[PDB]
Amino acid sequence: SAKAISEQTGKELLYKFISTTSAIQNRFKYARVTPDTDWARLLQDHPWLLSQNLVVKPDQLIKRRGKLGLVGVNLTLDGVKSWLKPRLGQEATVGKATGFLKNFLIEPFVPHSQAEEFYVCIYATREGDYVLFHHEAQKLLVGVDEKLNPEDIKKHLLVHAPEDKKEILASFISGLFNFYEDLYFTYLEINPLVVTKDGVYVLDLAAKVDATADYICKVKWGDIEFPPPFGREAYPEEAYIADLDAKSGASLKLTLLNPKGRIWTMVAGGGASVVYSDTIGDLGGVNELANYGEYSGAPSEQQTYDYAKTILSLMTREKHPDGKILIIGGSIANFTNVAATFKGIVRAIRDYQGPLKEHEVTIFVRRGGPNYQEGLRVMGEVGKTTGIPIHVFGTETHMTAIVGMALGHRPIPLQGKSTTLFSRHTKAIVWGMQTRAVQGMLDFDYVCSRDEPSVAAMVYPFTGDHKQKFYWGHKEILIPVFKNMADAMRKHPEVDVLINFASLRSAYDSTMETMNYAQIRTIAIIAEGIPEALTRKLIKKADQKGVTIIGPATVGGIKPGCFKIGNTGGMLDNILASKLYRPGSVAYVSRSGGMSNELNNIISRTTDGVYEGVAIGGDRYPGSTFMDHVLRYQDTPGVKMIVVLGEIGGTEEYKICRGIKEGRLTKPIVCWCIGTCATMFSSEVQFGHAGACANQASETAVAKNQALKEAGVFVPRSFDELGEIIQSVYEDLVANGVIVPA
Ligand SMILES: O=C(O)C[C@@](O)(C(=O)O)[C@@H](O)C(=O)O
Ligand code: NA
C-alpha cells in the first residue's frame, strides 16, 4: 500500500538523491523539534539556526497548516522558542481529528514575492503518472514505462511561465520526476516551490511512497518512518506486527484505533475484517472498537501465536467495567490451515488465561476453512480447561452473526480480451513448487468428472527437469516439471492458462516471460506485495498482447464443473459442501479471495449455485477489473444473474452504473460495497487491501452503494442481508422461467 511520509523524510530523500543539476537551495537546513529535544545539541548540529530568520511548523501530516495558523514565519531563534512554548505538547483540532502537537520542523525563512511561488505535483494512476504545474493547472501524463520529454515540459507545462525561469523550472521538474520514479513515490506535491535568482527552494512537501517496494529501495530509503495520520499515535505493538509481516509470506496487519476500547477483533482475511468492522459500526460499536487488522495467506502456527499474543496483551492493560469481547472471525478459508492457526491462538489464550479472566473477556469464534473442525474443537477445548467463556460457531452460522451476539448485550458477569477464460478442456501450467495446490486442483477435476487433469505441466527454475507424482482419483499419475519455461511451452501447445505462484520478488519477471508465449491467454498472479509500478508494466504488456491477468494478490477463482485456480475453494469437503462440482446460474466477482469462498457458500445455499467466480485481488491496479468480468458474464448465456462484492476506494463500480444506463448490462446484478465504517472514524484507516483508500467522497462504500441502487442494481442494506437479496432475485428468475433448476 502507499503510505505517507513526513515533510522532513521527503526533504531528506530529496536533498540526498535529486540530481544536483537543479539549483537546490538550503539543502539539509532543517531541524526537528520534539518535547525531548536537547536544544544545546540542536544548535551545535544546526548552527544556521542562530544566523538567520526562521520558519517553524508542525510536521505530522497536517494539511493547510498555513491557513490553520500553525506556522510561525520570519522569526529569530528566540521568537521560535516563544512561538513553540504555548504550542509544543498541547492538543489541537484538525477536521474530525484531535491530537498533540509533538513534532515540529524549523527551516530558514526564504524571502520572496508572490510571483516566485509555483506549484508542482506528481501522482500515480493505472495509466501512468501525471505532472501538474501552476504559477501562483497544466497537466501532462507520463505513460507507463515512458520518459518525461523535457520539451513537453517546456511546451505543455510551462506555456504561461516567465521565459527567464523556464530552463531552471524544466530542469527541476525533470529531476523531480526521475527522483519520483527511482524512489517509488506515488504522490509528491510541492506547494509552494519558490524560485528566485538564487535557485530553487522547497517550502512545503507532501508525499506517499509504495511501501511494498522496500526490497527495491532499502538502501536509499534507509530506516524510513511512516507516520500515523494526525489524531492517532504510533504504537510499539504495531511495529512488532509489521516486523512479523516482513518475515512472512503470509500477511499480518494491525492498527490500533482506541487502546481502551472493549471490542477487539482477530479476523482472518482483508475483506472479512472490513466486513466485521462494518457490522460492528452498524451496531453502534465503532467508538468502542479497539483495532483493525487481519491475518491471511496461511500463516504458520508460530506466526499466529505471535500475532494473537500481541492482541491479548493489548486487551489486558486496563479493566473495563463491562468486561471485553474478542471477535475471532473470518470467512470459510480457501487455503489457510484453520487447525494450525487456531492452535496458535489457543496457545496464546492459555499463556494469557489469568489476565483474560481478570479482565472479564468473552470470546466469540466463527470460522471455516481447511481443517476447520479440529480448529473449532481445540478452541472449545481451551474454553473448557481455562474457564474463559468462548462461544464457537462454524460455517452454518452466518459470517457476521457473532457480532450481534456479542454486542446485543453485555455478557452476564474498446474491445474486451475474451469472454470465456476456462472450460472443461482447460489445460494449465503451474509456476512454482506447489504440489499441494496442484493436488487440490486434480481432486476438484476428478469430482467434476473431467476426462483429464487440469494441470499439464509445472515450471520451477530452481530444480532440474523431473516428474512429480500426483493422485488422479486413486490412480498414481506423473506430471512433468521443467526447469525452463521454453521447454514446458513447446511440449504443451494445448496449454492456455498459467498459474503463477512465484514469490513477490520473482513474480514480475516470471509473468513478463510468460507473456512472450502467445499460446497463454490467461495468467493468475497469486503473490501479494508486488510494487504497483511493476504491476502497471504487467498491465501494459498484457493489454498489448491481449492476455487476461487475474491478480495480483489473489487466490484466483473457480468455475464449477470446469477449472479452478490453485487453492481456490479449498479441500474436497468444501467443494462438496458448497456444491462447486457442477454449475448453477450465478456468476460473481470480488476483490477478496476469502470472501469469494464465503460467496461460494452463500450462493450455494440460496441458488442453483455458482457458475463462475473470480477474485480480482486486493492490489491498487488489478490485472482485470470488475467491469471486465461483469462484461464476460453479460455475454455468457449460462449466466442469469451477477453478484459483485465491491469495496471502498476508486470508482470502478460506477462503470457498472454506466453499463446499465447505456443498455450494455441487462442481467440482474446484486452488489454490496464493503467499508461503510470508514466514514465513522475520526482519522482515515488504511484497510488490508492496497486498493481500499478513498481519495474523494465518491469512492466511499456508502456513496457507491447509493449510486448503484439508483441505477437499478439490487443492493442489500448491509452485507448480512446480501444472502437474502440474492435468494429473492434468484426466486423471481425461477418464477419468471429464466432459471429452470435441476
Ligand atoms: O484465511 C483466510 O480466510 C483468507 C485466505 O488466506 C484464505 O485462505 O481464504 C485468502 O487471503 C487466501 O489468500 O487464500
Ligand atoms: Na508478509
| φ/ψ (deg, to 5) at 338 | -70, -35
Asked if residue 395 has its Cβ within 6 Å of ligand 1, the reply is no
Ligand 1 site, residue 269, Cβ cutoff 6 A: yes
Other beta carbons within 10 Å of 525:
32
168 to each of 176, 300, 722, how far by Cα in Å?
A: 12, 55, 58
What is the spatial distance between Cα 435 and Cα 445, in angstroms, rounded to a whole number?
15
Distance 688 CA to ligand 1 centre (A): 12
The atom of ligand 1 lying closest to the CA of 597 is 9
- Taking the C-alpha atoms of residue 367 and residue 377, their distance in angstroms, rounded to an integer, is 12
Q: What span, in angstroms and rounded, lies between the C-alpha atoms of 618 and 591?
A: 5
- CB under 8 Å to 618, separation ≥6 — which residues? 270, 271, 528, 553, 554, 591, 592, 688, 689, 690, 691, 692
DSSP 267-319: -BSHHHHHHHHHHHHHTT-GGGB-EEEEEES---HHHHHHHHHHHHHHHTSS-
Which residues lie below 8 Å from residue 286, measured CB to CB, with a gap of 6+?
280, 677, 680, 681
Buried b or exposed e, range 261-297, using 16+ CB within 10 angstroms: bbbbbbbbbbbbbbbbbbbbbbeebbebbbbbbbbbb
| Active-site amino acid positions | 689
Is residue 333 classed as helix, strand or coil in its secondary structure? coil
The amino acid that residue 116 corresponds to is E
* Atom from ligand 1 closest to the CA of residue 594: 9
Any atom of ligand 1 within 6 Å of the Cβ of 297: yes
**Residues forming a β-bridge with 143:** 128
Which experimental method was this entry solved with?
X-ray
Reported in sequence order, the residue ranges of 573-658 that DSSP labels E, i.e. its strands, are 586-590, 610-615, 641-647
Cβ-count burial 616-625 (b if 16+ within 10 Å, e if not): bbbbbbbbbb
589 C-alpha vs ligand 1 centroid, how far in Å?
Answer: 16
Q: Cell 498484457 maps to which residue?
A: 542
How many Cα atoms sit within 13 Å of 575 on the Cβ side?
26
Tell me how far the alpha carbon of residue 368 lies from the centroid of ligand 1, in angstroms: 11
140: how many CB neighbours lie within 10 A of its CB?
A: 20
Whose cell is 439508483? That residue is: 710
Residue 28 CB neighbour total at 10 angstroms: 10
Pairing of strands 128-135, 138-143: antiparallel
Query: Residue with C-alpha cell 517550502?
Result: 203
Cα 573–557–546 angle (5° rounding)?
155
DSSP letter at 411?
P
Region of residue 74 (phi > 0: left; psi between -120 and 50: alpha; otherwise: beta): left
535 lines ligand 1 (CB under 6 A): no
Q: What CATH homologous superfamily does 236-408 map to? A: Succinyl-CoA synthetase domains (3.40.50.261)
Q: Is 172 in the pocket of ligand 1 (CB under 6 A)?
A: no
Residue 482 CA, chain-centre distance (Å), reads 33
Q: Distance (Å, rounded) from C-alpha 286 to C-alpha 272? A: 16
Resolution in units of Å? 2.2
Q: Give the CB-side neighbour count of residue 155, counting CA atoms within 13 A.
A: 5
The alpha carbon of 363 is separated from its chain's Cα centroid by a whole number of angstroms, namely: 28
Q: How far is the CA of 294 from the centre of ligand 1 (A)?
A: 10
Identity of residue 456: A
Q: Which ligand number lies closest to the CA of residue 367?
A: 1
Strands 548-550 and 522-525: parallel
Q: Which candidate, 142, 176, 138, places its Cα nearest to that of 155?
A: 138
Ligand 2 (single-atom ion) residues, CB below 5 Å:
245, 248
Strands (E), 114-184: 117-125, 128-135, 138-143
Report whether the peptide linkage leading into residue 552 is cis, meaning its omega lies within 30 degrees of zero: yes
Q: Which helix (H) or strand (E) holds 182?
A: helix 166-182
Closest CA to 653 of 639, 669, 640: 669
Q: Has 367 been labeled as part of a binding site? A: yes
Cell numbers describing residue 416: 474486451
